[PDB]
Every structure is written in C-alpha cells, then in structure tokens.
Amino acid sequence: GIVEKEGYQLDTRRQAQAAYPRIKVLVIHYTADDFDSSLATLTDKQVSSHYLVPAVPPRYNGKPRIWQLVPEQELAWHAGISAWRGATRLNDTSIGIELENRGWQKSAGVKYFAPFEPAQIQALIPLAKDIIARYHIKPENVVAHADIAPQRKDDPGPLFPWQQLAQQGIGAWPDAQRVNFYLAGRAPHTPVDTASLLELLARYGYDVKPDMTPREQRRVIMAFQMHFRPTLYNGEADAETQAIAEALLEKYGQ
Amino acid sequence: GIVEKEGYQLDTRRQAQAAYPRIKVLVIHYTADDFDSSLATLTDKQVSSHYLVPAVPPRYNGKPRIWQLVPEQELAWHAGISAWRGATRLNDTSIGIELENRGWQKSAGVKYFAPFEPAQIQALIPLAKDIIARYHIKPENVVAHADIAPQRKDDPGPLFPWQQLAQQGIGAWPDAQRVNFYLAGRAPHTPVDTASLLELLARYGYDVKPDMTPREQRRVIMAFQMHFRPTLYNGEADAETQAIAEALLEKYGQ
Ligand SMILES: [Zn+2]
Ligand SMILES: [Zn+2]
Known about the structure:
The structure is a homodimer.
Chain A: E1 2-5, E2 8-11, E3 19-21, E4 25-30, H1 35-41, E5 51-53, E6 59-60, E7 63-68, E8 74-76, E9 83-84, E10 87-88, E11 94-99, E12 104-107, E13 110-113, H2 118-135, E14 142-144, H3 145-148, H4 162-166, H5 176-183, H6 194-204, H7 214-228, H8 239-252
Parallel strand pairs in A: 4-11, 4-14, 5-11
Antiparallel strand pairs in A: 1-2, 5-7, 6-7, 9-10, 12-13
Helix pairs in contact in A: 5-8, 6-7, 6-8
Residues 29, 145, 153, 155 of chain B line the site of one zinc ion.
Binding site for substrate (chains A, B): 30-31
Active site (chains A, B): 98
Family (chains A, B): Belongs to the N-acetylmuramoyl-L-alanine amidase 2 family.
C-alpha cells in the first residue's frame, strides 16, 4: 500500500525483481573457552557473534537451548579481517555461530584439538538449516573462520564434522566418484605443484596473495585441509588435496 | 525471552554490545529516464534500487510520494562493481536512491547536465534523514554513484545540490575556514601534484589503483570535483581541489 512518513509517503505497491538478502555466508567458530567466559566475551565491546552453542546444550521441552546475542539483521564482530570468494569484511554479509569448544592445545608438542560433543552438533544442525534456508545461503558459503582468515584462525578445526553436516544439507562437500576421477590415478599423498593448488583454492574462495611466503602458502593449504581433508592438514600440496579442490570447483564453481 | 524453534529454542535474554547495522552507505543516482521507464527498468531482473523519487513528486496530504521498490533489509542492484573507503560490493552495505533526472546530454559538444527540480530535492531530504538516522550512517558515507565507481558513472552529477543537503545534515562537506587554511595562499586553480591529490582521495574513499592511466586518474579527480568542486570538474589537480580534500580528511578522517 502507501506508508505515511514525516514529510513524504512511501508507495510500496511496485516491487523490484532484483531484491536479495544482504546475508550470504554462515561462519562457524569455537570459543576456546567455557560457556560463561565465552558468553562474557562475546557480549563485551570488542567481539561478539549471533549465536553461542554450548558444549552440551541445556534441554527444554526436548529441545536444546542455543543463545542468540545479536539479531540476524545486525552484523556482529566475529570474522575480523577476512576475505572469501572475492568479498572482504565478511562481518557485513555473514552470520557467526560460536561453538563452545576448547579448540587446540599443544600436549607434548603435538597440537591436539578437542572433539565436538555430539549433542552440540545435533543442536547446531537445526539452527544452521533455518539460517541457510532463510537467506538461501549456498553450500560453499557455509565456512570455517579459518577459511576466511587462513593466516590467523584454525576454528572450528580438523575435528569439526563437515562431512556429517554436508550429508545433512549443510555446507559444500565433493563427490566421491569425482574426487577419484580427478586424482588421475595417483597416490592420495602424491606431491603436486603448490602453485597449481593455490590457484584452485583462490578460485574456490581462499584469500591467496600474489606474493606469499612458503609459511603463508602452507596456511592457506592447511586451512583448506582442516576443512575438506582433516586426515592430514600439513599444508603440503598433494594429489588428494588437489583432487578434492577440482571436484569442489566442479560442483560449486566460484 | 526464550523463542521456541524446530529442534531447539533461542535464548535472547543476553544481548551482545557489538551489534551494529549491516547498512552503512547511502548512494544517490539519477535514472537518466522518465518515471515510467525508470520504474520498469528498476523493477526488472537486471537492476533496481530501494527508492525512486520522481522529478516532481505527486503530493498527497501535503506530502510528496516516493516509491520504494526494495525493502531496506534486502540489497538492491544499484551500485554494481564498486569500492568505497576500503569496501567493495557496495550493494551489500548500502541503500540506493534513484532520482528521476535526464542526467547529461552532449549539446553542441558541451556535455550538459540537467538541473534537479527543487521539488524532488525537497522530497529527498526527509527520506535521506530517516535512512541516515535509522542506521547512523556517517556524513562521508552519503555518496554519489560516481564516487564509488569513478571509472563508470557521473551520477547524480555536478548539478546535484550537495552543499544544500549538507547544511541539512545530509552528507559530508568541508569548512570554509579550513579549506582556505589548507589552500596555503594559492590561487584556487593553482596546479598541484597529481599523485599527492590522488593519495588524499584514496584516503577519503576513492578507488585509486597503483597503476592508473592519466585518463583514469582524471576520472577519480573529476568524480571528486563533480561532488565537492562542481564549479570545475576537469579532473585536473589544483590548489582548491587539494585544499578541499585536506579539509574533508581533517573533518571526517578515513
Ligand atoms: Zn572464530
Ligand atoms: Zn547510478
């Protein structure tokens, strides 16, 4: 109809066809702290997120309770300096979901990660689906904080169940047959051209700069492996890593 | 309270402090067409805007009628490839207001622009203030499409009343005393270091690439001049242009 305003009125009878959501990405993080401490942090004037899922969510009426700290219409400070598929400032176009989880701890030199309680994951799935459906977020745009900030974050980490969620319609995941095909008859750990892999990763969305050190290049490859090749994420380019990138780019494009 | 959902419930009792709007910029354009044609275009599957103000808005109850084609919560396709103050894809974080106006036409070689009907401007002011206040948009973030896409657009053009609107609390505008001060005792048209100006413009928000042709450099300077130095926008760097940039950066930063 016609909305009355101060000094003018708005005629909303005519709606444009080019009208889409400002929200396109869903970022998963881990708090690396206990619930109360995470809650206090994510609610202070420095960092925040849209959701905070506890390690073992308190059940009410057969449903787990997830905290919401920021309205989805507003942006939260959870991504920081970031870049993904050609966009920067991901806080602007994304929704951040913090999962209570210790993250990693160097125990005997071996930087070990903390597994995710199945309860937490089960509570996340429903949430992720509402968000994704509510803004038609594409599978490749459901990312790890590490994916949009490879040089600074690892979260949610190698122990986060990306495949499990994919089979639930959440997140991008290659196709077995396609991954093998692209392997081109090579051992999964067969060394590959680093640069050729980085090219595929940049095309998939990873922030690859045209002048990175071997350390930075490993970071990008590593973050990619913690997501889609958790069995080994040393940041070394090999057949399987490249075979997975090719299948992902083939199924999700760029 | 506690919101009930499918498979989980949301506890919104705890609100984070870091919660801000995703909308930060307001872009002004001209349709370069009549109302009906502009309306048909801005509502088709290719381009659109959040608002369409007619040359002479139809009054109803003493108030002009402005059309709204896209909800402010959604993004519209009005900015295209763009960049401003470090951000790209301005469609994501902005609101676009199309003003019915012919734009420019080369009459006798002299590319002439079409003045803006005072009625249209009077209807715009109220609108712009609600938007700005509704998301606390900063003055320097109320821009010309040309400002975020210097190499492609001129709109709203040199005839658009930016100073008039500024005095109304809409848009950034230097301070007389400060502009003179920075002139450092020089004729307003005194030639200045092109590169030194481009640096100030890049710091203010203009997309300056580290390898532009003289033509592209003139575009950036020109777009800047059509906005803040409409008396002359030849894309040539001179005392006044630089003196204005310095006063703007001094009063709005970056
Ligand atoms: Zn994170
Ligand atoms: Zn425009």
